[PDB]
């Protein structure tokens, strides 16, 4: 459901999602920029029905950044990927847990497809960091 656009990141830091592959820790930096087009403007109700009809029916424009190696708060190596969405859409995500978690799934699956990874679906929001890296 990710519609990939090429965007040399990062935009503005947003929030940071911790997951992992079979080989190590992976962080998804959800960022935003006015450069990234928004998805179609729909209500939460209309969105729910689209997912019933197509698991990937709601296409979201986003960048899928190249991996960069970083050190976590404990000084250990990890991978970060910068994933940027539209700024106005990001504000909408801030006000909807359902919308935010949908976008996180689409970003995770987008990265899985692009980099041939299996990423743990049991992700967690980082509380001490909006962004892994500089």
UniProtKB/Swiss-Prot annotation:
UniProt effect for mutating residue 74 to A: Reduces binding to TELO2
Site (Interacts with TELO2): 18, 25, 74
Alphabetical keyword list: Nucleus, Phosphoprotein, Transcription, Transcription regulation
The keyword Transmembrane helix appears for this protein: no
GO CC aspect terms: cytoplasm; nucleolus; nucleus; pre-snoRNP complex; R2TP complex; ribonucleoprotein complex; RPAP3/R2TP/prefoldin-like complex
Positions of post-translational Phosphoserine modification: 134
Coiled-coil stretches: none
Similarity section: Belongs to the PIH1 family.
Domain text: The N-terminal region is required for binding to phosphorylated substrates while the C-terminal region binds to the other R2TP complex components.
Protein name listed in UniProt: PIH1 domain-containing protein 1
Lineage start: Eukaryota, Metazoa, Chordata, Craniata, Vertebrata
Gene: PIH1D1
